[PDB]
Structure formats: C-alpha cells, structure tokens
Amino acid sequence: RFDLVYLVLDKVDEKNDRELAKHLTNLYLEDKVLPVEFLTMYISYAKEHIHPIITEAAKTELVRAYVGMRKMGDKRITATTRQLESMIRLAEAHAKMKLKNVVELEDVQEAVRLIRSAIKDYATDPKTGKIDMNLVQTGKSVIQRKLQEDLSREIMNVLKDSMSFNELIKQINEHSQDRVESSDIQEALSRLQQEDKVIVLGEGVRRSV
Amino acid sequence: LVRSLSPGDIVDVTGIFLPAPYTGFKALKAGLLTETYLEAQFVRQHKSDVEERVMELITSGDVYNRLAKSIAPEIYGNLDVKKALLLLLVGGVDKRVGIRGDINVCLMGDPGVAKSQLLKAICKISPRGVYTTGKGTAAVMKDPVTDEMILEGGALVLADNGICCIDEFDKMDESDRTAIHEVMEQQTISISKAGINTTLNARTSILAAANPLYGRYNPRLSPLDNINLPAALLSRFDILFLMLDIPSRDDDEKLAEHVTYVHMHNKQPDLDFTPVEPSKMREYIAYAKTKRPVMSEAVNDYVVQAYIRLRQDSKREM
Numbered sequence: 001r002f003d004l005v006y007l008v009l010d011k012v013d014e015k016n017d018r019e020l021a022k023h024l025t026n027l028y029l030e031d032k033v034l035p036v037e038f039l040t041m042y043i044s045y046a047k048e049h050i051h052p053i054i055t056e057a058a059k060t061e062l063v064r065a066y067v068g069m070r071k072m073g074d075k076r077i078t079a080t081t082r083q084l085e086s087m088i089r090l091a092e093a094h095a096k097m098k099l100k101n102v103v104e105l106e107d108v109q110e111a112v113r114l115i116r117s118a119i120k121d122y123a124t125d126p127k128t129g130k131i132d133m134n135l136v137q138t139g140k141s142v143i144q145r146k147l148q149e150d151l152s153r154e155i156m157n158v159l160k161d162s163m164s165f166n167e168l169i170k171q172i173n174e175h176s177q178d179r180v181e182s183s184d185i186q187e188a189l190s191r192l193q194q195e196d197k198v199i200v201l202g203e204g205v206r207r208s209v
Numbered sequence: 210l211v212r213s214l215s216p217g218d219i220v221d222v223t224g225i226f227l228p229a230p231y232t233g234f235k236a237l238k239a240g241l242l243t244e245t246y247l248e249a250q251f252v253r254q255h256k257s258d259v260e261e262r263v264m265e266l267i268t269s270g271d272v273y274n275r276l277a278k279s280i281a282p283e284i285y286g287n288l289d290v291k292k293a294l295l296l297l298l299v300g301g302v303d304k305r306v307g308i309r310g311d312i313n314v315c316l317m318g319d320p321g322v323a324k325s326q327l328l329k330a331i332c333k334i335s336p337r338g339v340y341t342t343g344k345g346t347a348a349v350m351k352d353p354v355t356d357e358m359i360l361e362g363g364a365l366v367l368a369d370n371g372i373c374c375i376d377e378f379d380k381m382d383e384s385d386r387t388a389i390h391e392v393m394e395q396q397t398i399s400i401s402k403a404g405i406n407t408t409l410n411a412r413t414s415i416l417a418a419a420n421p422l423y424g425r426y427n428p429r430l431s432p433l434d435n436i437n438l439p440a441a442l443l444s445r446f447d448i449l450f451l452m453l454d455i456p457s458r459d460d461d462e463k464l465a466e467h468v469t470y471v472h473m474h475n476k477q478p479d480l481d482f483t484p485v486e487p488s489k490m491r492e493y494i495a496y497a498k499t500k501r502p503v504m505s506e507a508v509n510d511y512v513v514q515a516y517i518r519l520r521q522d523s524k525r526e527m
C-alpha cells in the first residue's frame with residue numbers, strides 16, 4: 001500500500017564510514033542557507049494556493065513510463081496500476097512544490113526516477129514486484145508446485161497405500177530431495193485436497209480417492 | 210512545622226496525642242469510640258572540609274582500584290564490573306543536545322551469581338537510589354477514594370536524580386518494557402489515563418540484572434538468544450557485561466573462605482583499603498559537573514579512527 005518504501009541501511013564499509021563518523025564528530029564538536037522554519041508554512045501555502053493540473057504531454061510520458069516498467073521483464077510481473085496511480089501522485093506533488101500548478105513533463109520523469117529507484121531498492125536483485133505483494137515468490141512457489149506433485153506421485157507408487165504425516169516425511173526429506181521444510185508438505189496437501197487428488201483422514205493417515 | 214515531613218522520612222515526631230472527636234451525626238452513630246491523632250510539636254529526623262578530605266584521599270588512595278572494591282567488599286571478584294559501576298555512579302555530562310549524561314549497564318550474568326547483591330550494594334550507597342524487581346515501575350492514579358489524589362508516582366520517578374536497580378530485568382512485562390523504553394531515551398515518563406497526557410520527570414540511570422532463561426547461561430548459544438530481551442533495547446545500553454560463574458578450583462575456595470569469615474565475624478575480611486563513605490562520589494560529581502570536561506580535538510580524531518577500526522573488525526569477525 002506504500003507508494004515509496006525506502007530501505008535505509010547502514011552497511012559496513014570504511015570509505016563511507018570514515019566520512020559518516022567525521023560528520024558525526026562534527027556534531028560532537030558542535031554542541032557542549034536553510035529555511036529552518038519558513039518551510040512549515042511554505043508547505044501550507046503550496047497546499048492551498050496551488051492546485052496542479054496534469055496535461056497531455058505528461059499523460060503520454062506517464063503512459064509510456066508504465067508500459068516500459070511492465071515490459072522490463074515481460075512471465076514475471078514488475079509494476080502495478082496502484083504504482084501507476086501513485087506516480088500520478090508524485091508528479092502532482094512535484095508540480096505543487098515550486099508553485100507551478102501544472103504537471104509539466106519534467107516532473108513526470110522525476111517521479112518515474114524516484115519510483116524506479118525505490119523499486120530497485122525494496123525488491124530483490126531480479127526485481128519482482130510480487131514478493132512485496134505476496135510472501136509466496138516464484139522461486140518459492142516452484143517449491144510448493146514441486147512438492148504437491150511429488151506427494152501425488154509418491155502416494156500413487158505407495159498404493160502401487162496411505163500413511164500419516166511422519167511416514168510421508170520419511171520418503172520426502174530423506175531421499176526424494178534435500179532437507180526441505182516440513183510444513184510445506186502439508187501446505188501442498190491443502191492444494192491437493194482442493195484438487196481432490198488425495199484425502200486426509202484426520203490427524204493420522206492420508207490416502208488418495 | 211508545615212512541609213517539614215516527607216514520605217521518605219524516618220522521624221521521631223514529638224506531639225500531643227489527642228482524641229479527635231467524630232462531632233456531628235456519625236457521632237451518635239458510633240459512640241464512645243474515639244479517633245486519635247498526634248498534634249506534632251517537634252520533628253527530629255533520623256535518616257569545603259569534605260572537599261579537602263576527599264582531595265587527601267585522592268592523594269593517598271587510588272580511587273580507580275579502591276572505590277571498585279569498596280562498592281562490594283563482601284562480593285569476591287568481578288572487579289571490572291565494579292569499575293563500570295563506578296562510571297555509572299559518576300556518569301558523564303553531555304546535557305547539550307543536537308545529548309544525555311546517563312550511563313546504563315546490564316549484567317546478563319548467570320543464576321547463582323551475586324548480581325542482586327551488587328544491585329543492593331549500589332542502591333544502599335547511591336543517593337536517590339531505588340531497587341525493584343520486574344515481577345511483583347509505571348504509575349497509578351487516585352489510589353485513595355476519599356481524598357482523591359492525582360498523579361501518584363511509581364518506582365522510576367523516585368530515583369529521579371539517582372539509579373534504579375531493576376533486578377529480574379528479563380521477567381518484566383510489555384507495559385514496563387514500553388515504560389522503561391520511554392524513560393531510557395526520553396528521561397521522562399508519561400501517562401494517558403484520561404487524556405491528560407501528564408508526564409513525570411524520571412532522569413534515572415538504569416542498572417539491569419537480567420538472568421538467562423532456562424536457568425544457567427549457555428555460552429554456545431548467542432547472547433541475545435539466552436535472554437529474552439529484544440536487540441533494540443539491549444543495543445541502546447551504553448555498556449553490557451556478561452558475567453557468569455565457572456566452577457574452578459581456587460576462586461571457589463577463596464569465595465567460601467570470604468563468605469564463612471563474614472558469617473563468623475559479622476564483618477568483611479578486611480585485606481585492603483575499603484572506603485565506606487559515599488560523599489566522595491557526590492563531591493566528584495558536584496565538582497566536575499560545573500567543570501564539564503571539554504573533549505580535545507586529538508581525542509575526537511583518535512575516537513573517529515577508533516570507530517573506523519571497530520566497525521572494520523566487526524565486519525571481519527562476521
């Protein structure tokens with residue numbers, strides 16, 4: 001739901017740390033042009049007097065920006081219409097600031113740069129735009145989709161019958177694959193139940209119809 | 210005599226013991242059973258020469274190694290913990306903000322180690338010092354129905370210009386967690402009983418004595434895993450000591466001899482200089498508080514390279 005989510009990190013490196021700590025020591029030595037207070041009313045003046053209006057060149061630039069973001073990766077799903085509407089918001093805010101009341105072209109790519117940098121920050125290295133919208137990422141979703149079919153085939157060859165959870169763990173985490181997490185197997189069992197491929201008989205055994 | 214008595218007093222009040230009568234209607238209601246009060250007449254409390262004396266002690270006794278052993282003479286070992294407790298007792302002064310001059314230390318320790326004894330020793334010598342446990346701070350409003358008083362204090366406000374010895378720090382609930390968090394980076398506790406949003410000044414130095422869960426400390430396990438304290442709260446502590454006991458062959462023997470001698474003679478086995486009076490620390494804080502030792506520029510340099518190399522080794526270790 002957040003338009004811009006900045007991942008403020010303090011990763012270690014001596015090059016940056018030297019400057020940061022020198023600037024901090026400046027603060028220690030400080031105590032023993034900037035509108036410091038004019039801005040708190042300048043913001044109100046811009047919020048009241050200025051009513052930004054977006055124009056056709058800005059419209060074309062925005063549509064283009066969104067289509068471009070999406071195609072950056074199109075199987076996966078990069079940006080979403082909520083992000084499009086948020087950009088409609090950052091451009092309007094940038095026009096509100098500087099007191100121009102018109103969303104010119106420049107504000108559009110300024111907001112696009114901000115949005116793109118934010119996405120590049122808070123998404124994984126192959127920027128997904130879906131992990132933020134869903135804990136189940138594709139690199140994770142493949143795990144459940146493999147486990148469900150492995151469970152189907154496993155139970156089939158067994159009947160070739162059924163068992164509770166412990167026995168199912170015995171032939172999955174041991175030799176079928178690596179030491180995978182246990183709850184993922186019963187999670188894929190839920191999808192199998194929805195597909196009606198297998199039936200779970202209470203806490204104990206579980207077979208297939 | 211008004212305003213000569215306060216709740217933190219032990220006094221020998223002299224007065225005329227008089228039968229206050231229930232004059233009115235509850236008078237006939239009750240009868241001959243009178244109520245009494247003491248019309249107080251005289252209150253006797255019980256509870257640069259000192260500067261010269263403490264200066265001479267500085268000349269003679271080595272404060273760094275003497276006051277440390279003086280804090281807990283009956284507690285054997287853990288000298289560096291006592292040295293840190295001296296720093297907490299004195300504390301730096303950095304009131305100017307842009308910060309704080311309160312030193313906070315936590316002793317994760319181990320069950321069976323005399324952390325509580327150290328806390329009590331600090332409480333009994335530190336002015337405005339209080340001792341409390343996690344399970345039985347905060348505040349309560351309008352405790353008596355009749356008088357209907359407003360904004361009664363707690364445990365942190367009492368040690369305003371002092372130290373709070375929070376024993377059993379791990380076993381302390383979320384409400385007190387938030388309260389001590391507010392106190393620690395605000396030096397002022399507040400309440401929101403009826404939208405009043407009143408606040409109480411509690412600039413208390415925090416001395417915690419949390420102990421590992423599941424009994425004895427596990428050195429193999431990570432320190433924050435051994436004690437149920439969030440890293441956010443622990444990381445804000447100025448200095449932290451993990452001081453657990455190890456079964457040895459000689460330390461235990463000396464400890465047993467010390468404790469048994471205390472039991473025989475009702476006095477510590479005096480083997481070194483053991484100052485008793487706490488007024489020396491009060492003189493030191495009152496003296497250098499106005500002085501406010503100004504840091505040197507070379508000091509600032511050496512500490513900036515100190516931070517650089519500290520962060521470098523922190524990375525290279527991880």
Ligand SMILES: Nc1ncnc2c1ncn2[C@@H]1O[C@H](COP(=O)(O)OP(=O)(O)OP(O)(O)=S)[C@@H](O)[C@H]1O
Nearest residue numbers: 283284285286319320321322323324325326420468
């Ligand atoms: N170094 C020491 N010198 C003298 N007495 C000690 C020492 N260490 C422990 N004791 C004795 O241990 C007792 C106090 O230990 P505690 O501080 O209660 O241990 P503890 O770790 O606080 O236990 P808890 O409640 O699990 S935190 C007293 O009988 C002390 O005499």
Ligand SMILES: [Mg+2]
Nearest residue numbers: 324325326376
């Ligand atoms: Mg104890």
